[PDB]
Amino acid sequence: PGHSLEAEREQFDKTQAISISKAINSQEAPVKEKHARRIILGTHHEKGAFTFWSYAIGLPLPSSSILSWKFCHVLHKVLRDGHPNVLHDCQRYRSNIREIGDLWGHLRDQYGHLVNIYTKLLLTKISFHLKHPQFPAGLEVTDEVLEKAAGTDVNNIFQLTVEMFDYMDCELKLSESVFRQLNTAIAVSQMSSGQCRLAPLIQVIQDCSHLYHYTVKLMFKLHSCLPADTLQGHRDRFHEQFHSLRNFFRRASDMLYFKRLIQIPRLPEGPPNFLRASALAEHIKPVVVIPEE
Ligand SMILES: [Mg+2]
Three-state DSSP state, 98? helix
- Total of domains in the chain: 2
| Residues constituting the chain | 293
Residue 85 resides in a domain: yes
Closest CA to 213 of 126, 284, 124: 284
Residues 103 and 143 in one domain: no
Q: How far is the CA of 6 from the centre of ligand 1 (A)?
A: 11
Q: Which residues lie closer than 8 Å to 256 by C-beta, 6 or more apart? A: 187, 188, 189, 190
Report the largest interatomic distance among the alpha carbons of the chain, rounded to a whole angstrom. 75
Q: Is-contact 28 191, C-beta < 8 A? A: no
The CA distance from 289 to 262, in Å, is 6
The CA distance from 60 to 205, in Å, is 29
Residues 159 and 284 in one domain: yes
Q: How far is the CA of 136 from the centre of ligand 1 (A)?
A: 26
Q: Which residues lie closer than 8 Å to 155 by C-beta, 6 or more apart? A: none
Residue 134 resides in a domain: no
Closest CA to 200 of 167, 166, 175, 172: 175
Q: How far is the CA of 281 from the centre of ligand 1 (A)?
A: 51
Method for this entry: X-ray
Q: How far is the CA of 93 from the centre of ligand 1 (A)?
A: 18
Which domain-ending residue is among 119, 147, 164? Answer: 119
Q: How far is the CA of 131 from the centre of ligand 1 (A)?
A: 29
Q: Is-contact 50 89, C-beta < 8 A? A: yes
